[PDB]
Design a protein around this ligand. Structure first.
Ligand SMILES: Nc1c(C(=O)NCc2ccc(F)cc2F)c(=O)n(O)c2ncc(CCCCCO)cc12
Ligand SMILES: Nc1c(C(=O)NCc2ccc(F)cc2F)c(=O)n(O)c2ncc(CCCCCO)cc12
Ligand SMILES: [Mg+2]
Ligand SMILES: [Mg+2]
Ligand SMILES: [Mg+2]
Ligand SMILES: [Mg+2]
Ligand SMILES: [Zn+2]
Ligand SMILES: [Zn+2]
Lengths: 367, 183, 367, 183
DNA sequence: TGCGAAATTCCATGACA
DNA sequence: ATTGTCATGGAATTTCGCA
DNA sequence: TGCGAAATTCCATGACA
DNA sequence: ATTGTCATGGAATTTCGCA
């Protein structure tokens, strides 16, 4: 009333342009605008109007305003619209993001063999000799790979396989995803007794285990080819696949994982004989030169509409296994620490501290 | 001649029989001639079948040019000869009753016998679980002749488990009392 | 022998450069090249050598050659390598493509309402009043949408729903995917009795039904928001969702599907009143102007490494539901006709004629 | 005054009882006042409950400003008044025993009665399946006053099912014989 | 004939099993 | 015999209110 | 000091549940 | 408290064989 009372008689109020005539009709303040005659509601009604229009179909900024503008006009309508969108809990947790993640990191290759292992499970596969799964262990520096068939992706089967592997050498770090077999306390106990630091991927982000995941692709691709036109009896092929892939050249490196681990081919077909006249000490000297000079990619260009996390920002974590007709996003949470441009710590929806990948976050819209 | 390299020659031999440990009685010893690196595989018998199963594991990691052994039955069989021929492995045998390998390999096989004996006493049926730490110890043992350990000669790096506390390898007088009690 | 005999004595043979000395050793023709000494095998052995090296791990061009080059050299090695790769059946049906499809078509919007319907099923959903599925029917021109709850995605439930819908109007064309409910002869019989032409998408390509698929996203998104913090009782909400989405503005069009179908808002909240003083005939005249002038997108730019189909080309269709450790691609087939840059007819692996999308094809490598 | 538009006024009325057809006895007729477009919903009774169920279907497509009806019990109930108030629909009633709608609507309701009667005879229990084709016929019928059909006035286009063969709508003399036999 | 702010348009992003 | 689609919210661009 | 062909490198594409 | 990866085959670029 008070603000709109002075408008009818002809005073200037900030926000209401002067060149339009504001009249009264049906007990309502109106205005003649180029689109047509619109009602100017009092300030105390506008929040309710924006809410009624939004709740029709929980529409975004422009689709909600186009409803309101059919009947009403007032100064800076979209500001009141955006204020409601930032307060609508259902839209915040249901809507999709329209900003991409920042470009991926390319972590430095481990300097030495047995500095970092990457492990993961493939399966379930067609039963072969009662075995359903395969434990894949990949050395980060060389790409050298060990395969172990198991009957379940269990902690017990993981310990049995790694005890056979660590007969050769003990690694500094073992990296795994947060699967049940690797997150159990039994597995942490097994690692601490051997001086092995367990490193875990951020949850629901297999990119982080990409070294062993990419090797899983090659293992399955070779098994597929070897089993063409045959029953899928893969148990007997694992030693063949293991040896074949470990002695396969990486076209970008110009070396096989066997060569990067040992510096010399064993008695395999087409063995390289370039270092035949060097001594072993001369050979190992050339091997240290080869390991340090391997090709390493760099971060790609950011896409034109990416976001990067800032401390104190409102972000929402992706719901892991969302049920049917349930929101895809958790409620807003705050970024505590930025570990790197792609990894952050947040104050969880329950109250905990949680380390997440930026790919499983969206920035909360409308601040 | 060409310098000696890893995988040029594996030396294999059986150790046993031993007290049963989870159903296993023997140990297949494989030693790389150049590096002294050692692999240990427990078997239920010194047969061609158990040898082929153990070496199928090892040869999925690396294949030697030559395998050297004594004239044991498991190694002189035609099944083992066919197995070696399929993988391009030349078999090489010592004269009967004159086992000759090499000084580095002789002393390594000596270390394995005495290191097994020292850890057998007190827990004679629990050696199956100890084979991993036995291999680590053997492969990270300083060589007197060469400057480096087997691990260093094979991978060209230092190890994450060095064994600086070089154990005596001899039997203490109390271990002679409990060893003289049984067998 | 014959070709290599003249080489040892010193004659020139095409392909073998002259500046290198070709000698004999261990009964084998050799050559001193910058990398080292290599064996030159006779012509009759080379196919077998390339095959032995490839079959180690069924490697591609460079990874296979790097094996061969450790021991051998001969003129134009990669030609013999590529010849084998094109003949290896296992690699052709197992390997992935590395060429993208050509840019998508943006079919012209149907000119009139009821010219083309798009129909599809959503489900299964959480049980609500014994109903598990929803039949979604979208008019191509307007986007106006009808929702029908069903207990199965069956032909019987489709006919019952469309009989209620066609009380309003009969469409010229009904477009659907190749689901079981729409491909049955009972449904074709129902359509021919009413003069409705049935149009089907290429198999396993829901892009082609993209108009109704995109509407499925909006339906589920609104249902999700309305059911936040409630049991998923969606049966009673379908009429609400239907009305809400049909009266929701498309920000790029500046119109709601209701407005495009009727040219006037009904008694809904925030109804537009711009045409209040026009007659209905003046209104329908403006409606025909609005329908023809709607925004329409164009084909995007092709990616830098795309392929487009040519008549007579060897292509392979993607296996639909491939089993574990089985190839992802069918055996090579030939392109009979190019219906458009994104759709072709091929001579199937069985012998039939099959109409497929280019997204479910790869061009066979190595010709 | 403002020109007459679709959805300005729906006219509703019940037709029945009829011979049972898949358990249905009545027909709710809804006619748009401006276009003459007609919706037909079969019900089991002329109750407020069956009216609300049928109109909930129609009002999920389009909501009228005004609903006009006679003083039937189903339409004068306070349940139906609460239903109309929730959707912003003004209810409008004719005087008892003086049903007045409009000339266009009167003649349309006349067409529906006679078109139902003509297709009832011969197959009196199978009218539930015929309601779709009845609506198509009614909504694609040429208007004498206006130049266009109800379909054209509502959607602004020609229809894919025009009904050029304008059926006589009268009863043939043989249909009088079979109609005079039953009821 | 030009300025600051508001309004509008642009458009990459992602999800429809 | 067939073919992607479009709501979303920051950013980019255009228009408005005033001079 | 330059040409045609071969060899090599480049790199977008897609799949690891 | 953590992080994508790399085989593949056409295309682009460099190198080779010869003059
Ligand atoms: N989903 C899993 C994938 C997977 O999806 N791989 C495909 C894939 C997709 C993309 C990409 F870049 C690489 C890539 F390999 C996987 O590989 N592993 O090993 C898993 N292991 C266990 C669990 C269950 C959840 C455990 C706790 C997670 O926090 C799931 C997964
Ligand atoms: N898979 C099916 C999808 C689907 O995957 N949608 C996600 C999706 C992905 C990408 C995209 F661009 C749009 C998009 F909606 C689907 O929507 N419908 O309706 C189906 N209906 C039936 C069958 C079973 C096979 C029937 C014969 C097919 O030839 C599968 C699907
Ligand atoms: Mg995993
Ligand atoms: Mg995995
Ligand atoms: Mg479908
Ligand atoms: Mg679908
Ligand atoms: Zn909302
Ligand atoms: Zn192959």
């Amino acid at each position: 009333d008070a603000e709109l009372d002075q408008l009818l008689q002809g005073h200037y109020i900030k926000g209401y342009p002067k060149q339009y005539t504001y009249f009264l009709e049906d007990g309502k303040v109106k205005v003649s605008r180029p689109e047509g005659v619109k009602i100017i509601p009092p300030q105390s009604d506008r929040q309710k109007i924006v809410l009624q229009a939004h709740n029709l179909a929980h529409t975004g900024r422009e689709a909600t305003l186009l409803k309101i503008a059919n009947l009403y006009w007032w100064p800076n309508m979209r500001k009141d619209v955006v204020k409601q969108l930032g307060r609508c809990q259902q839209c915040l947790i249901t809507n999709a993001s329209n900003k991409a993640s920042g470009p991926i990191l390319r972590p430095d290759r481990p300097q030495k063999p047995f500095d970092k292992f990457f492990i993961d499970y493939i399966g379930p596969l067609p039963p072969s000799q009662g075995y359903l799964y395969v434990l894949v262990v990949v050395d980060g520096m060389t790409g050298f790979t060990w395969l172990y068939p198991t009957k379940a992706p269990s902690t017990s089967a993981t310990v049995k396989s790694l005890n056979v592997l660590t007969s050769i050498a003990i690694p500094k770090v073992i990296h795994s995803d947060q699967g049940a077999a690797f997150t159990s306390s039994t597995f942490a106990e097994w690692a601490k007794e051997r001086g092995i630091h367990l490193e875990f991927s951020t949850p629901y982000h297999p990119q982080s285990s990409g070294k062993v995941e990419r090797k899983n692709s090659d293992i399955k691709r070779l098994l597929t080819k070897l089993l063409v036109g045959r029953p899928t009896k893969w148990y007997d092929l694992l030693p063949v696949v293991q040896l074949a892939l470990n002695n396969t050249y990486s076209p970008v490196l110009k070396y096989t994982p066997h060569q990067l681990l040992f510096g010399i081919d064993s008695n395999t077909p087409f063995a390289n004989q370039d270092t035949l006249d060097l001594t072993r000490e001369e050979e190992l000297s050339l091997l240290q030169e080869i390991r340090t000079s391997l090709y390493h990619p760099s971060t790609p260009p950011a896409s034109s509409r990416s976001w990067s996390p800032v401390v104190g920002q409102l972000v929402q974590e992706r719901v892991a296994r969302p049920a049917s007709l349930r929101p895809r996003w958790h409620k807003p949470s705050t970024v505590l620490k930025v570990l790197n441009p792609r990894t952050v710590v947040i104050l969880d929806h329950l109250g905990n501290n949680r380390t997440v990948s930026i790919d499983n976050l969206k920035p909360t819209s409308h601040q | 001649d060409r310098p000696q390299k890893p995988f040029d020659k594996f030396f294999i031999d059986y150790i046993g029989p031993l007290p049963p440990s989870q159903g296993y009685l023997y140990v297949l010893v494989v030693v790389d001639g150049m590096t002294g690196f050692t692999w240990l595989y427990p078997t239920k018998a010194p047969s061609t079948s158990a040898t082929v199963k153990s070496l199928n594991v090892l040869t999925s990691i690396a294949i030697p040019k030559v395998i050297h052994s004594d004239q044991g039955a498991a190694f002189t069989s035609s099944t083992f000869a066919e197995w070696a021929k399929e993988r391009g492995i030349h078999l090489e045998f010592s004269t009967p009753y004159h086992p000759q390998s090499s000084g580095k390999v002789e002393r390594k096989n000596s270390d394995i016998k005495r290191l097994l004996t020292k850890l057998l006493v007190g827990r004679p049926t629990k050696w199956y679980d100890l084979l991993p730490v036995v291999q680590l110890a053997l492969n990270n043992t300083y060589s007197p002749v060469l400057k480096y350990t087997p691990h260093q000669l094979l991978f060209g790096i230092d190890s994450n488990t060095p064994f600086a506390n070089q154990d005596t390898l001899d039997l203490t007088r109390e271990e002679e009392l409990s060893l003289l009690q049984e067998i």
